[PDB]
Amino acid sequence: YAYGEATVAKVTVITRKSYGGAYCVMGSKDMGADVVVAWPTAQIAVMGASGAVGFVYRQQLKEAAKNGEDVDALRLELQQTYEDTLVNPYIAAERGYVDAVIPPSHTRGYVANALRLLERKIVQMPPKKHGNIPL
Amino acid sequence: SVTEPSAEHQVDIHTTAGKLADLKRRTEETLHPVGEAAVDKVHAKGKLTARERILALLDEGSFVELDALAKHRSTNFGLEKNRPLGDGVITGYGTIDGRDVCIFSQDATVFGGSLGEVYGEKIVKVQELAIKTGRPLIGINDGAGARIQEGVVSLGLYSRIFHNNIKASGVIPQISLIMGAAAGGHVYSPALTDFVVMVDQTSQMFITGPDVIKTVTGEDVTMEELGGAHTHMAKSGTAHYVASGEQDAFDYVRDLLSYLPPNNYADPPLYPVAIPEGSIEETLTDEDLELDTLIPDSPNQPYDMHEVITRILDDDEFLEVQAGYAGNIVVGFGRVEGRPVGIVANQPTQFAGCLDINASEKAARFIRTCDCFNIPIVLLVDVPGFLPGTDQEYNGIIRRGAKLL
Amino acid sequence: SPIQTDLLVAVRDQGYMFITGPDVIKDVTGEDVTFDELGGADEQAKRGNIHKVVNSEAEAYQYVRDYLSFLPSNHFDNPPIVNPGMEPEITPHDLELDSIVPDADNMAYDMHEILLRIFDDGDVFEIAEQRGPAMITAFARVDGHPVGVIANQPMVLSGAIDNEASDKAASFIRFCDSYNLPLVFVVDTPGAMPGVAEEKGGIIKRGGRFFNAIVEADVPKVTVIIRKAYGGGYAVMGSKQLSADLNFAWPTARIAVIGAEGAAQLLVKRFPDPNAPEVQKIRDDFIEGYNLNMATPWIAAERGYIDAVIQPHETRLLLRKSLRLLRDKQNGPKVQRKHGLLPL
Amino acid sequence: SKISKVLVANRGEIAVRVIRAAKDAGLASVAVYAEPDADAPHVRLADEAFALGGQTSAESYLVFEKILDAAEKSGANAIHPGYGFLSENADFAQAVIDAGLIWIGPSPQSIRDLGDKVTARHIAARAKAPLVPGTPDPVKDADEVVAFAKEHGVPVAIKAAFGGGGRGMKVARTLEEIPELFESATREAIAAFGRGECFVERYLDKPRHVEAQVIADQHGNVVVAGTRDCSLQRRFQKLVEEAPAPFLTDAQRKEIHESAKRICKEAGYYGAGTVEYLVGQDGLISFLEVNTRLQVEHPVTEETSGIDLVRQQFKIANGEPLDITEDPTPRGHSFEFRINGEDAGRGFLPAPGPVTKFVAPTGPGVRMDSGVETGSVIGGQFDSMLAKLIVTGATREEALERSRRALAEFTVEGLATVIPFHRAVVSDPAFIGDGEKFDVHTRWIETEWNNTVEPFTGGDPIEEEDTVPRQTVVVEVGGRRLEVSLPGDLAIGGGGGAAAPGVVRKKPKPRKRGGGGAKAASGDAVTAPMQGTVVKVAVEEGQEVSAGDLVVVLEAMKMENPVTAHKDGTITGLAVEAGAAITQGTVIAEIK
Amino acid sequence: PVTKFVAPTGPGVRMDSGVETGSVIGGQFDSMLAKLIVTGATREEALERSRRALAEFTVEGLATVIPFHRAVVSDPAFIGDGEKFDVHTRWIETEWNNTVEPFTVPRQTVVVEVGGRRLEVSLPGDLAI
Amino acid sequence: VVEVGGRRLEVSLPGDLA
Amino acid sequence: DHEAHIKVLRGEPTPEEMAALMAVLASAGGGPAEPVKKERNMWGHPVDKLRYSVFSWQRVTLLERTHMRR
Ligand SMILES: CCC/C=C/C=C/C/C=C/CCCCCCCCCC(=O)SCCNC(=O)CCNC(=O)[C@H](O)C(C)(C)COP(=O)(O)OP(=O)(O)OC[C@H]1O[C@@H](n2cnc3c(N)ncnc32)[C@H](O)[C@@H]1OP(=O)(O)O
Ligand SMILES: CCC(=O)SCCNC(=O)CCNC(=O)[C@H](O)C(C)(C)COP(=O)(O)OP(=O)(O)OC[C@H]1O[C@@H](n2cnc3c(N)ncnc32)[C@H](O)[C@@H]1OP(=O)(O)O
Ligand SMILES: Nc1ncnc2c1ncn2[C@@H]1O[C@H](COP(=O)(O)OP(=O)(O)OP(=O)(O)O)[C@@H](O)[C@H]1O
Ligand SMILES: *C(=O)CCCC[C@@H]1SC[C@@H]2NC(=O)N[C@@H]21
Ligand SMILES: *C(=O)CCCC[C@@H]1SC[C@@H]2NC(=O)N[C@@H]21
Ligand SMILES: [Mg+2]
């Protein structure tokens, strides 16, 4: 609520992990982050790969279990493939949830530029007496 | 020329009549988007479907469905081979007691009710409609989090939904029914709405599942202990009502709405009442005279403050809120001469009526809801002070007691 | 001063409007022109400087009384509510809509057959009928509340949106927004009328003004698509993307970037051998596939570009329910400022 | 061979009737339906149903290939044609026989011979039937017609040798009319029937229509099951029918019963059939027609004579001899009332519409044969008849009394019907009679009946007071049950709500273009006034036309409506072709 | 509740009915809803017509004896050999194969007086007027 | 005015009924 | 005459019964009486309690219209 209410300039720098509901909380774009940048080490995903594999490959793991295979090594291989495919900044950059994937040294420059431009933000909420934040 | 048995014939799709029949076939398919066996299994579990829940809450025949024919567009992990109509949430508008509401209802039979991109867009659409129209939004929540085969797109839709809940906060009444297991991202939207009604023993809310809890902490816990309606009433103070069943939950929602205006600037729903003339003393009733003997002679003796509440309110009717939580304070709605009022009252029968952390936060947010929606408040006061104890200090009686102030 | 007003009503053969008369035209420029050719009532109604032509002053007065009967006295107040609550159930007239649209896609039909049935009664009060006759701009009532109706007329020029149709719609939309009338869009159009004459006549800016007006308007916007919604016709005739509030389509709706024949034509621009039998076979098969899979309601419905596909008989009562929901619409967020600019 | 599965090549009430007869006989039944009939009762009642496709008769029930394909696919071994469509198409009867199916009907030759009017006249003369004075052969010229009319006097009817549906005749009252009438007759008989042949006979001024039901087997036995009187006709099509024929001498009645048998034997006829006659004001009988099909009216004969005539058709088509050896004695009296979807308040014009309610009468003496039910829809594509009400009693008086009851009970809502006419005529002295004669005749409905039926408006609010919402409540006062309609704004006593702020009541405008003071705008589009089928196009593109010129004929409810040029100009965009289905408001052409 | 009631029609059928669609049957009165009367030229024909009419007869929302009638009209004990039949006044409770499956606001009153008469006026309890 | 079977029937009442 | 009249759609009451019916209905009819006017009093109206951004379009379409509408 606090982040979504806020109308000052909101800049996000993702430095590794941003998963799930915590991704939504920590200054996601659709919560109104004005500038979102990610370092090359950013990992933006629904959940960690060991959890995700359980559900996205549960059928294959069950078939391998019926075949009596080394399903532990199968899980390791599927998890490595999930990490290599999805657990990175680029899927969010493809969706435009990340505005730029930057070398970490660029962070201060992107922040300074955004903050200089957003001194006045012409944004508004619907008229209300006050909100009703959870208490 | 060719003549088909009636079982395989379809009216020629090139004619207007054939296009009408095609729309009928598609509409029929939307009534059971994952096949009839799933509906049969819902009824076998004693639940209603998302559609039946909408049609039970709303006034008969008032529902207009939107995006009935939506289908997801994901191609990850073979999702494209299963594209159920409506994408697992039913959305639209209608009336409750003749006043217009916007509504959505999540369908646990479609991917466990997990939120995909199109599912999220549908919810966002009815949120935006409610906000622009200044009409209450009712969400019926029942879903296993983000639809994991869809990527971070589901997180982007969650963020859009939360941002809409925050925009609407204090603008239109927002009511969340929990009618199944709401997991992960599904829990925050209820928390941002104004009222939460959970169904006893058949609905749950939790961020993290019991199995992850077991892995990280070693704690064994059932999903019912972790997130049940009783837990969210009595412990965490998140549920405003625990219904004994789905119809009881709908009745509570209709009662809530009857006290609320449609938006933060409309006039409240005043009931017509016959007001007797004369002075207060001329107008005293026998039930009023019963208050003169309510207070025990000894100051050490409690009494039930509901004896005051039900005598000052019309028809003795009082809709209590968070009845099972922080029972040392009582809050709820009633009417005085047809005017909706919010009651806040100390309850001598629990902790001598002391204020504590939980009672303070219960009354604080109740008062702020009433003041958002222009409902006047009546305080019935019998408070000896704050509940003493180091646990109260360490958990923040100063900071959290300041919220009621 | 008259051209500033909202409604110009001229008496035939009696009312004329022109800057310079025939004499001065002849003497300065040598060209000769009659009062009728220069500025007769019917000519000015076709040019769109006049909104109505009538045969007598009594008829003009009655047209004024009817016109005012749909409107508030001012920007702030409320219009009359006339015959609320008639016919709360599905009528035979509603059921007549299920077969009103011709089977063949080439067939023109009169849009008034629909407009006379989807509102509270036959009181569809048309304004500027002679201007841009491929477009209807009318007042009607829904549950007794007045609304502005913008509808394509397939009977005339296939319902294509020409220059005068574009500026008629634009000015009617701005007027209706100014006096808080909800807007109902009834769509059956191939989009903008192509050709050198329309381009030189200004079709780009006039369409731009139609787009500008429809997005500017704060009033409730509801759309019903009947058959065609191609290209800019789809976009401008109250699409959801241009901020329409509720969007319905009949099962005969066809929503696409271009019609089947235009898609087939560019298909055949490549490997062009249009005399051969085989390319005519290829065109026929392409058009068949396109009208089955592309130019339909169903892609827009599955993407949620439209809110519902409806049986035609539902339309009247569904319009009532929708505009009841939208009655208190607040349009925002908008930044208050001196004014919006428009292509001009 | 023997019938085992009957395909009912028809729709509506007659299809239901034959399906029911097949179930009684223990035969399997196959329905066929056009797309408009996909939900019809007969489609749901038959043991099987096959979709012919197509929207109109010309592309469904009239298509031999489709009906024979449905029979092949269903494995039906017999076809019953009902009435209309192909029931009297001799080439269809032959095609059915060539397919090896049992044709439940008369021989193709009998159909062809009795369908040719002048061959039928020769057969009747050979049978020594009573004939009206008339020409034995087609007349060749208006001068020959004038010579005939000079011999026999006036009026004279000139009639098409193949015509039907009441269009087969014109009448000349004065000699000078003959050339124009003959021109019109030969023209329109060529146009409608493809044959120009015309013949001339004495026109009877106020005749009754009387007809004999025949049952004839393939072994040459014939039984006259009874007579009907069908004199209550509109546009020469029947509306009310009764059995036995009342107010006939025994000499007349026996002459009918005997001439019908002679005629059938000369025709070689077998099956059910009917011999139609006219009875003059002088009481002279005159042969009129043989119908080579089951009659629409057959159930009043069934009720009075105790014979199931459709099952008799099955027996005859099985080739069994008649088990009835002698003409039944009628018991009681029966009326049939055709429940046509026609508004008697607008000259019995038919209109399509939804059957939002249908409550048949029940109880003593009532039989209902209906092709529709609550929720049915009547499209513009087929005949207007919804149902038939048959009322039977011990006497003509008791049948009239029961008819007044049953017609008071009969409720139909959502489209116009002739029920208000039936309610009148069963109470009209001209049709009650004096106990020995009655005044009705084949032109009485148009030229004598005091038409007081108010035009149908359904539920439409028309006056200002109609727009006000209403509530209906049951009040009991002293025990009396009253139904009381209360306006939603009743300002009685302290009541109010006469206007919420700004509410105005005014007369609602009809859902029609413009004011009624003018026909049309100056616009160039000729637009279809109704749903229908374009049956004829009378113009071509580039033709110049003048106001009033015929542009197309649209058939709806099997009636022709001419659509005509509203202005002079050039036909500039002819968009329709014959056989095209068309919707109201469709642009047919632009006149420029 | 009589949620649906579709009497048979057509040749030889008479329906005498005390109920229609939407009627409610309570326990206060005898169970008879209606009488279906079927007539034919012969006993055999009347049975054939009865098998038709009872196959058409649709009643929904409560149990009825229609399945019993559908059996007995096809039962050799009632069709008879053509000169006798085997039914008797105990043939249903015994001897018949019972293969039928089991089925699966107050008014306001105002006592007015008008001249010499009392008149109770009874109104619906929610009359909005 | 009351309509009873299509008859008109004036009924006159006091102006002060509840 | 274009008032919507009471109609007795079924039944034929005797004049005594018509009088009892109409007297009872006229006693039931109540509430509004004559069309009194609720006097306009905009003090403390809800729209005045809302926070509006300085550039909020709702200042025109909600606040101003609510004050001006008559
Ligand atoms: C929320 C924010 C809101 C913001 C909104 C903002 C608001 C909106 C903005 C606000 C809107 C701004 C509005 C600005 C106002 C416009 C400014 C006006 C200036 C002019 O625009 S100023 C033109 C100067 N002017 C001509 O052009 C003559 C036309 N141009 C020609 O070229 C004419 O053709 C010409 C010149 C040849 C003749 O002039 P004619 O007037 O056109 O007509 P004619 O001569 O043919 O008539 C018949 C003639 O016969 C004569 N005559 C008459 N009676 C008798 C008699 N009894 N006996 C004898 N002789 C007689 C007499 O001469 C008469 O003449 P007349 O008609 O009486 O003058
Ligand atoms: C931010 C949100 C996140 O990060 S997701 C948080 C954890 N993800 C979850 O799925 C929560 C736990 N989900 C589940 O396993 C169940 O749905 C829960 C909620 C425990 C309830 O179990 P229940 O529905 O009774 O039995 P079940 O799990 O066998 O049935 C689930 C059916 O739906 C599916 N499903 C479930 N969750 C998801 C999901 N998140 N994404 C995609 N699909 C999901 C399952 O595959 C199963 O479908 P099916 O029966 O196999 O055809
Ligand atoms: N000579 C006549 N005088 C008076 N009326 C006549 C005469 N011939 C025919 N009619 C009228 O025509 C009606 C029907 O005529 P007719 O039976 O010849 O045609 P139809 O029923 O159309 O024939 P079809 O079986 O070929 O369709 C008769 O009921 C009678 O009303
Ligand atoms: C005797 O008076 C002391 C015991 C009572 C102390 C009570 S407890 C609850 C109230 N809160 C507080 O701080 N003192 C009061
Ligand atoms: C057409 O829709 C089906 C047959 C019904 C019309 C036919 S025409 C000849 C018969 N005579 C009559 O009145 N109806 C029957
Ligand atoms: Mg005939």
Automatic annotation (TrEMBL), chain A:
Part of the intact protein present: 408 to 542 of 542
Protein name: Propionyl-CoA carboxylase beta chain
Similarity comment: family membership: Belongs to the AccD/PCCB family.
Source organism, top-level taxon: Bacteria
Automatic annotation (TrEMBL), chain C:
Keyword Ligase part of the UniProt annotation: yes
Domain CoA carboxyltransferase C-terminal positions: 92-329
Upper taxonomic lineage: Bacteria, Bacillati, Actinomycetota, Actinomycetes, Mycobacteriales
Enzyme class: ligase
Record has Metal-binding as a keyword: no
Secretion signal span: none
GO MF terms, alphabetically ordered: propionyl-CoA carboxylase activity
One of the record's GO cellular component terms: acetyl-CoA carboxylase complex
Record EC number: 6.4.1.3
Alphabetized UniProt keyword annotations: Ligase
Tree of life domain: Bacteria
Protein name per Swiss-Prot or TrEMBL: Propionyl-CoA carboxylase beta chain
Family from the record: Belongs to the AccD/PCCB family.
Automatic annotation (TrEMBL), chain D:
Entry-linked Gene3D superfamilies: 2.40.50.100, 3.40.50.20, ATP-grasp fold, A domain, ATP-grasp fold, B domain
Keywords: ATP-binding, Biotin, Fatty acid biosynthesis, Fatty acid metabolism, Ligase, Lipid biosynthesis, Lipid metabolism, Magnesium, Manganese, Metal-binding, Nucleotide-binding
Domain Biotin carboxylation: 2-446
Biased amino acid composition, Basic residues: 504-514
Pathway the protein takes part in: Lipid metabolism; mycolic acid biosynthesis; Lipid metabolism; fatty acid biosynthesis
ATP-grasp domain ranges (all copies): 121-318
Residue ranges annotated for the Lipoyl-binding domain, each copy included: 515-592
GO molecular function annotations of the record: ATP binding; biotin carboxylase activity; metal ion binding
Region (Disordered): 497-524
Enzyme class: ligase
GO BP terms, alphabetized: fatty acid biosynthetic process
Cofactor(s) this protein requires: biotin
CDD domains the UniProt entry points to: biotinyl_domain (cd06850)
PANTHER family: CARBOXYLASE:PYRUVATE/ACETYL-COA/PROPIONYL-COA CARBOXYLASE, METHYLCROTONOYL-COA CARBOXYLASE SUBUNIT ALPHA, MITOCHONDRIAL-RELATED
This protein's name: Biotin-dependent acyl-coenzyme A carboxylase alpha3 subunit
Lineage: Bacteria, Bacillati, Actinomycetota, Actinomycetes, Mycobacteriales
TrEMBL record, chain G:
Domain of life of the source: Bacteria
GO MF: acetyl-CoA carboxylase activity; propionyl-CoA carboxylase activity
Protein name: Acetyl-/propionyl-coenzyme A carboxylase AccE5
Species this protein is from: Mycolicibacterium smegmatis (strain ATCC 700084 / mc(2)155)
Residues represented out of the complete protein: 25 to 94 of 94
